[PDB]
């Protein structure tokens, strides 16, 4: 049963059961379906169906976000989710390359909001349309794009991963069946919908008839409020990045007693530290922990493995598990040949979860996707190895990093930093003494200025970067110098610059 038919079924059978909950607001399955059907109708009156143009859905975790997501696919348009977290210029870039002809913001027209070069409308005024609706044949289907999520692009511009219904349906069927999340449970949603991790809870919940429960950025900053919301949520499934749960764990009160009904933790998008797993197994004896791996290009996650005490003591580094049933995952050397067990190589993913590629970016798709031995495959850029059918992720081959669960390209940050009128060159160094990245240091060659003090220059640049880059991509520290060290080849000497940056670190 297709995701959409499943959502309609629940709405027809259990209309009054809650589908969505966020900041005191609730949306029943009937309200969800009937509203998304109305938005879908309203949408077909403002844009053309000639193309399968994307529809940006802008907001945070309002009930209107999902009502709009569903409205787009039901109208026949893939949607591009955009969090308030994403700044205006970046939003302008997504618009520009996506070809999107409509932007819906779940909240009322934000006052003095940054105007965009696109037809803009609030979810509210969309719904004031007659009680119209769309016919089943309009809904997105098969390999037509369902959603498009943009991630970091090394060339300095976000690239959009196209996830077709089939893609998602493959992901959703996998989660709902092979994980104890079925049964109409309450799912937590912490990740903004602009990140695909959210999809791990959003749709398997909707397909299984569960109730989604959001915890917004407001509650996230005020620990007390958060734990309170979590306390009342009565959640059963916890889906988030390991980083977020790690933050919660710092509070001794975060335990089975705060969440008596919590029984399933779903993690993905980043390294799940043994310490986090170890700890969770302690404060939540009634909940099983799952570690899953995968890139956005392969629809959230394609590997899986329950984390038990047995597994913890069996390895210093948690494995990412066994390949999704229908997926074919293997290790390939540089030459592009399959390696044997235990031998380190690059992770490649082939199967129905793989995205057709980057929207309007053929050359990029060209380098990353390809037809392996039938299956459509993807070069993850992750180094790794398999052992007894169990996959292990071991680092990066490129300049793509993970900072507190956030995916980003050092070269993209360098691009944006280099754009400031006060910058000539820029090199971002990630401080990772051991395994994980702790923060970023920007090595900059400034143009020429009148700023009396450095902090003023740093401030000016950082104030600029806030318009094109999400806050988490802006380097914490900024150091300045005269020249960017280069190697023989003519490449940027990142190894040497890092050493430079740390030496200057001891000079106060």
76 versus 158: smaller Cβ distance to ligand AMP: 158
Minimum distance, C-beta of residue 347 to ligand AMP, in the bound complex (Å) = 8
Query: Binding of ligand AMP at residue 291 (CB under 6 A)?
Result: yes
Query: Binding of ligand AMP at residue 469 (CB under 6 A)?
Result: no
Q: Which stretch binds ligand AMP (CB under 6 A): 6-14, 206-214, 292-300, 453-461?
A: 292-300
| HSE value, Cβ hemisphere, 13 Å, CA-based, for 322 | 9
> Who's near 401: CB < 8 A, 6+ residues apart?
407, 408, 409, 410, 430, 437
Helix (H) or strand (E) holding 403: strand 400-403
Query: Binding of ligand AMP at residue 382 (CB under 6 A)?
Result: yes
Q: Is 296 annotated as a binding residue?
A: yes
Which residue in the set 98, 380, 420, 468 belongs to the binding site for ligand AMP (CB under 6 A)? Answer: 380
Q: Is 491 annotated as a binding residue?
A: yes
Counting other chains too, the contacts that 221-225 makes at CB distance below 8 Å and 24 or more residues apart are 223/251
Q: Which residues pair with 441 in a beta bridge?
A: 429, 477
> If we measure between CA atoms, which residue out of 164, 206, 208, 173 comes closest to residue 189?
206
Which residue in the set 153, 295, 351, 446 belongs to the binding site for ligand AMP (CB under 6 A)? Answer: 295
47 versus 249: smaller Cβ distance to ligand AMP: 249
Q: d(Cα 9, Cα 180) in Å, to the nearest integer? A: 21
Q: Which stretch binds ligand AMP (CB under 6 A): 123-131, 291-299, 383-391, 463-471?
A: 291-299
> If we measure between CA atoms, which residue out of 5, 146, 166, 143 comes closest to residue 81?
146
Residue number, nearest CB to ligand AMP:
407
Q: Which residues pair with 396 in a beta bridge?
A: 382
Minimum distance, C-beta of residue 241 to ligand AMP, in the bound complex (Å) = 9
Q: Which residues pair with 12 in a beta bridge?
A: none
Site string for ligand AMP, 383-412 (x = CB under 6 A): ----------x--------x----x-----
358 phi and psi angles, rounded to 5 deg:
-85, 125
Contact at 8 Å (CB) between 58 and 82? yes
> If we measure between CA atoms, which residue out of 182, 142, 180 comes closest to residue 163?
142
Site string for ligand AMP, 212-251 (x = CB under 6 A): ----------------------------------------
Site string for ligand AMP, 142-161 (x = CB under 6 A): ---------x----------
Contact at 8 Å (CB) between 77 and 43? yes
Q: Is 295 annotated as a binding residue?
A: yes
> If we measure between CA atoms, which residue out of 33, 71, 34, 63 comes closest to residue 212?
63
Contact at 8 Å (CB) between 235 and 262? yes
Q: Which stretch binds ligand AMP (CB under 6 A): 56-64, 286-294, 325-333, 424-432?
A: 286-294
Minimum distance, C-beta of residue 150 to ligand AMP, in the bound complex (Å) = 11
Known binding-site residue numbers: 151-152, 196, 291-296, 300, 382, 407, 491
Known binding-site residue numbers for ATP: 151-152, 291-296, 382, 407, 491
Residues that bind ligand AMP (CB under 6 A): 151, 268-272, 291-293, 295-296, 320, 380, 382, 393, 402, 407
């Amino acid at each position: 049963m297709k995701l959409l038919h499943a959502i309609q079924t629940h709405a027809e059978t259990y209309p009054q059961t809650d589908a969505f909950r966020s900041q005191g607001q609730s949306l029943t399955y009937q309200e969800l379906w009937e509203q998304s059907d109305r938005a879908a109708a309203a949408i077909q009156k403002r844009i053309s169906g000639e193309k399968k143009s994307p529809i940006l859905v802008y907001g945070h975790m309002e009930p209107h976000m999902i009502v709009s997501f569903l409205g787009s696919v039901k109208a026949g348009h893939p949607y591009i989710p955009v969090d308030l977290s994403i700044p205006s210029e970046r939003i302008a870039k997504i618009i520009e390359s996506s070809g999107a002809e409509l932007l819906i913001h779940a909240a009322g027209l934000s006052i003095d909001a940054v105007g965009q070069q696109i037809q803009t409308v609030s979810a509210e005024e969309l719904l004031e349309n007659e009680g119209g609706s769309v016919s089943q044949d309009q809904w997105v289907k098969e390999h037509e794009t369902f959603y498009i999520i943009y991630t970091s692009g090394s060339t300095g511009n976000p690239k959009g991963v196209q996830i077709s219904a089939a893609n998602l349906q493959s992901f959703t069927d996998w989660i709902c069946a092979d994980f104890p999340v079925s049964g109409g449970k309450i799912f937590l949603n912490q990740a903004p919908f602009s990140f695909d991790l959210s999809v791990m809870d959003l749709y398997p919940c909707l397909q299984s008839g569960g109730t989604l429960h959001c915890v917004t950025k407001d509650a996230v900053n005020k620990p007390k409020v958060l734990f309170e919301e979590l306390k009342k949520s009565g959640l059963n499934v916890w889906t988030s990045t390991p980083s977020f749960v790690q933050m919660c764990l710092m509070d001794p009160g975060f335990s089975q007693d705060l969440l008596p009904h919590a029984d399933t933790f779903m993690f993905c998008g980043e390294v799940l530290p043994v310490s986090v797993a170890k700890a969770l197994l302690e404060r939540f004896p009634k909940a099983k922990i799952f570690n899953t791996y995968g890139p956005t290009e392969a629809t959230v996650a394609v590997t899986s493995v329950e984390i038990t005490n047995d597994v913890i003591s069996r390895s210093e580094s948690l494995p990412v598990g066994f390949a999704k049933p229908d997926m074919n995952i293997f290790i390939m050397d540089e030459e592009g040949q399959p390696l044997p067990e235990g031998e380190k190589g690059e992770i490649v993913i082939a199967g129905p979860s793989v995205s057709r590629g980057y929207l309007g970016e053929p050359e990029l798709t060209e380098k990353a996707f390809f037809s392996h031995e039938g299956q459509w495959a993807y070069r993850t850029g992750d180094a790794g190895f398999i052992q007894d059918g169990q996959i292990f992720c071991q680092g990066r081959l490129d300049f793509q990093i993970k900072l507190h669960g956030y995916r980003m390209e050092l070269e993209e940050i360098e691009f944006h930093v280099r754009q400031s009128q006060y910058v000539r060159s820029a090199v971002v160094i990630p401080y990772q003494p051991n395994g994980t990245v702790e923060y970023l240091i920007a090595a900059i060659v400034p143009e020429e200025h009148e700023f009396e003090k450095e902090f003023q220059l740093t401030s000016a640049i950082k104030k600029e970067l806030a318009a094109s880059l999400p806050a988490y991509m802006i380097p914490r520290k900024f150091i300045y110098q005269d020249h960017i060290q280069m190697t023989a080849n003519g490449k940027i000497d990142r190894k040497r610059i890092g050493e430079e940056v740390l030496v200057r670190s001891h000079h106060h």
